[PDB]
């Protein structure tokens, strides 16, 4: 509604690969629109780097060969800021919806808060690249104020809770 | 703050968005105006849900809420063709969207009633849950009626 | 001990669901009559592993997926680096069931620890994953859009108009 600033192993694995392709299908449907290149590219960057964290938390096991960068998280907070300038300022609690592109991307917000939470339960049991916990954390807020400018962008109104 | 606690929020807030997306697809077509003005009051309900299993010291979603998805489900289920078979996921792609909307309100519903299990809930909410997937089964029937194109029964040919 | 078996259904219900999208997406382009027709009678023995765990599916239809699934990498370009899930919209539903598929096969497989039940399910979703990949690239192929590929060079190269 705002922005919020072993076999725990394969599903952390599994529910980042699933996060990764509602990315794909958010990227597929926001290419067929025209004025938004850099949230593709960072899309697609989000990927590559969502493919590290998954060989992070499994595939991977030496520290010294963590692919996933601290950059990649403080660039995903960079754009929050940004495209939250961009928005309107939102004085309203949002509801998922809108166009069908932020409504794919809030889509992608709630399965990262999933794989978080997901990752959440992993550390809990064992140590893990810390770095990819916090990306997910600032991935989730990333979707929202990219839907929302995604929104704006199209000319329609983000969906506001009223009651 | 609890996992089970945190696990249906989250569950419900994946629902909720589905059917963002859905509703965002039944906007663009004619003849259903009645199924998108009830997505959207169900996304607030839903809001409403979550508040109300975050609540951990009086609570927001109403009795009524469940009663008005029963009577759509009535009206929906009347007004598409009696079945004599079970369905599958399908149809056009509204239709689609909102049978996975059914699957995940289920899944919603099996982490609030976990939940219930390990501690007292609003148990409105969980029964509002267990309405809302039958309401998208009967949602899902009819916006193929409407749009002439056919519920895909389960034919053999294997 | 019980809701192991329930959330292996809901599961698999909610992976028939995304298939269905898949096929309403995919139908609605020529080209892939193949597929459209798999996909429904995939939905069909979907169907039936949800009433085996409360037995219809034969090992039958997992040699099926078997063939499908070296036919279409046949098909497709012989990949020499790392996909990443995308590409047409249909590629991109048809990755996203495949990392359903595993979801679904993780909650059976815990359905196993508890007790065990018909060992063909789990064959067929092990297989479907698969399936799904393959076919998500003969359709990206058949498009002329080439899977994405693990690629961060060829990021810098992506329009940044705005």
Redesign the interface.
Same mark, same amino acid.
């Not at 990764?20 to 299908?25: R, T």
């Not at 509801?95 to 069908?100: C, D, I, R």
């Given at each position: 509604?705002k922005l919020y600033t072993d076999?725990l192993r /394969? *599903?952390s694995y599994?529910?980042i690969? $699933?996060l990764?392709?509602?990315?794909?299908?958010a =990227?597929? $449907?926001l290419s067929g629109q025209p004025?938004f *290149?850099?949230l593709? &590219?960072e899309l =697609?960057?989000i990927?590559?780097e969502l493919?590290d964290c998954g060989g992070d938390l499994a595939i991977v096991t030496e520290r010294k060969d963590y692919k996933l960068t601290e950059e990649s998280v403080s660039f995903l907070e960079t754009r929050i800021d940004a495209y939250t300038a961009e928005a309107p300022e939102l004085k309203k609690?949002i =509801?998922?919806?809108?166009?069908?592109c &932020?409504? =794919?991307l809030? %889509?992608a @917000?709630? %399965?990262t808060? @999933?794989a978080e @939470?997901r990752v959440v339960?992993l550390m809990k049991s064992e140590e893990i690249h810390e770095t990819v916990l916090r990306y997910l954390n600032r991935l989730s807020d990333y979707f929202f104020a990219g839907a929302r400018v995604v929104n704006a962008r199209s000319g329609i109104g983000d /969906?506001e809770? $009223?009651?």
């Open positions: 509604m076999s /394969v *599903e599994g529910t690969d $699933e990764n392709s509602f990315i794909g299908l =990227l597929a $449907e004025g *290149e850099d593709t &590219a =697609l960057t990927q590559h493919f609690f =509801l998922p919806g809108g166009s069908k &932020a409504s =794919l809030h %889509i @917000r709630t %399965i808060r @999933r @939470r339960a /969906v809770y $009223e009651r």
